[PDB]
Amino acid sequence: IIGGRESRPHSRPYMAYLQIQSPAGQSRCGGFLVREDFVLTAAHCWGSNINVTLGAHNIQRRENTQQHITARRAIRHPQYNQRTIQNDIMLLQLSRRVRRNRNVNPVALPRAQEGLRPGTLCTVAGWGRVSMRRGTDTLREVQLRVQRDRQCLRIFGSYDPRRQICVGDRRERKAAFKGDSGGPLLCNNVAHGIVSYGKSSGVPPEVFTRVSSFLPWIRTTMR
Amino acid sequence: AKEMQNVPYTIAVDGIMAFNQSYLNLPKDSQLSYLDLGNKVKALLYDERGVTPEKIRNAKSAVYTITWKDGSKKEVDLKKDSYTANLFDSNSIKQIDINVKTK
Amino acid sequence: IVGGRRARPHAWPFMVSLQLRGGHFCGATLIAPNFVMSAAHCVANVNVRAVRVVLGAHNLSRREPTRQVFAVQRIFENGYDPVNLLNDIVILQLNGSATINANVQVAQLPAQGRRLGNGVQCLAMGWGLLGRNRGIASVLQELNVTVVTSLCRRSNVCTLVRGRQAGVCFGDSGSPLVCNGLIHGIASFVRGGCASGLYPDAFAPVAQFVNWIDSIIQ
Numbered sequence A: 001i002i003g004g005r006e007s008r009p010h011s012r013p014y015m016a017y018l019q020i021q022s023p024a025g026q027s028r029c030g031g032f033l034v035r036e037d038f039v040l041t042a043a044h045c046w047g048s049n050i051n052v053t054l055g056a057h058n059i060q061r062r063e064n065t066q067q068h069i070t071a072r073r074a075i076r077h078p079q080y081n082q083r084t085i086q087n088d089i090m091l092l093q094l095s096r097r098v099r100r101n102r103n104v105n106p107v108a109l110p111r112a113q114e115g116l117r118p119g120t121l122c123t124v125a126g127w128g129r130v131s132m133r134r135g136t137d138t139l140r141e142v143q144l145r146v147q148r149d150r151q152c153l154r155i156f157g158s159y160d161p162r163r164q165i166c167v168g169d170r171r172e173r174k175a176a177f178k179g180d181s182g183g184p185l186l187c188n189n190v191a192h193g194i195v196s197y198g199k200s201s202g203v204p205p206e207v208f209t210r211v212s213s214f215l216p217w218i219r220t221t222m223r
Numbered sequence B: 001a002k003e004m005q006n007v008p009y010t011i012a013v014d015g016i017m018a019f020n021q022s023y024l025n026l027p028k029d030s031q032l033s034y035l036d037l038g039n040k041v042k043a044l045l046y047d048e049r050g051v052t053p054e055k056i057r058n059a060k061s062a063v064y065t066i067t068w069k070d071g072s073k074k075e076v077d078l079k080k081d082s083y084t085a086n087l088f089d090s091n092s093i094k095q096i097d098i099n100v101k102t103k
Numbered sequence C: 001i002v003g004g005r006r007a008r009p010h011a012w013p014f015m016v017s018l019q020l021r022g023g024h025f026c027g028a029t030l031i032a033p034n035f036v037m038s039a040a041h042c043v044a045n046v047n048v049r050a051v052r053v054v055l056g057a058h059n060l061s062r063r064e065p066t067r068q069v070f071a072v073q074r075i076f077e078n079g080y081d082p083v084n085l086l087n088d089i090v091i092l093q094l095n096g097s098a099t100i101n102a103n104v105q106v107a108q109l110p111a112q113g114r115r116l117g118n119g120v121q122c123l124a125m126g127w128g129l130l131g132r133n134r135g136i137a138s139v140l141q142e143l144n145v146t147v148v149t150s151l152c153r154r155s156n157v158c159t160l161v162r163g164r165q166a167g168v169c170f171g172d173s174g175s176p177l178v179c180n181g182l183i184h185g186i187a188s189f190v191r192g193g194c195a196s197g198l199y200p201d202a203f204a205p206v207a208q209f210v211n212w213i214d215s216i217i218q
């Protein structure tokens, strides 16, 4: 997160920290708990083995509030497009149900085809980098505004407003950044978006997957 | 070299960069050629962003930039088949930033 | 060297290994008791002061007290352009001078201007990769080559082991190309990969830098 603030510890108890390992390399991503047994995240965060940490604030410390669970199944959307980063949504079926408590509990999803007006204030949270030079051990968050689609459509030629959300003001140094992928766009306490992509510079606007456009696939996959 | 170096890398294609934080494994305390590393970069371009060899061929530009531990940078043109005949240490690579523009 | 042969022990006492963290990354040529000469790209992204110049080596896997070892004081280059691979040469001053003897002798360079042409028979050598994923060579290798003037660019000396798949490979960069007794070449780059039998290996033209060379070692 660029231009944000350290989270109040455990104030966002749906947050999931993802450590992804494959023979050729690793990745770190965010995600969010949507049922006691499923985490939603970005499909470009997929890999051979996925460790999920719930209940964390400092991911560099083995805090006793943390629950470590492996992804039994990592289900990328079947039409995920790696070239353009479209349909960028993945469900993780966890190996065990989480123990729900104050530090671990799911977040609500939007209603079908729910929309978001430009100007809506949302919060995004994650453990990603805060600049080119520095990272964070603890959870950070920033408030961002939903934009009119035209702000993204010219910069990101493959942007599709039917399946994605355009977020962030171009003149601000406030954004999600590297390592924040898969974390939620929270508007009015509902997860409307998933952090997906933007510019190498981290300058806004940036693109989020529009959760409401995938609710049937979500529901079908979880049952 | 059983343990591996984890070198941060970024991929931008057509002005789009995914916001994961990713690392490429290289054998620790190993020597490598620009052919080896270039081929690893090509494999990564394909498996992470679906970028094919033909796409690198027809791209306006296709490069990757190695930031070495000394602070020096080398820019490698992926469209080229010329390789310097030297070897370099895997522990000397601090960062790799890959950028493809089909403009 | 791919498709080559083990050099006779101390056959070429002007040959040099450049090591770093114990690693032969490039070859080089004793051009003066206090000066070696290599390829500029061999040192453009490394800490020189860690580099060790090893003279009188034969089997790098073995300790050989015969070996002399030095460290670089100063580098001297002449416009290595990496983008287009022009002027791929460097001369390096050691932290002393070598004891010229049975295992260590200064090489001999061609005349400024001398060019050479299609069909000359030269020898390449080095400790680069042996090719069949056999790994890097500990015993110095050598390879009969023929100068080709083909896809070769105007600004290089290019070579081919025509008739079979052999050539220079990685770690052979900087090593000499000896033609009629004279170090005419510095390994600079390969095309597509090693021992293509399609593209010649490209060497930097030692004979094009003779001028500057003398200007630094006299």
Ligand SMILES: *[C@@H]1O[C@H](CO)[C@@H](O[C@@H]2O[C@H](CO)[C@@H](O)[C@H](O)[C@H]2NC(C)=O)[C@H](O)[C@H]1NC(C)=O
Binding pocket: C121, C122, C123, C143, C144
């Ligand atoms: C490969 O190169 C070596 C070294 O130059 C050749 O061995 C030389 O043979 C020539 C005769 O052509 C003699 O002038 C020298 O006495 C030999 N030199 C050494 C160092 O032994 C060898 O004949 C070459 N082979 C080919 C096919 O060119």
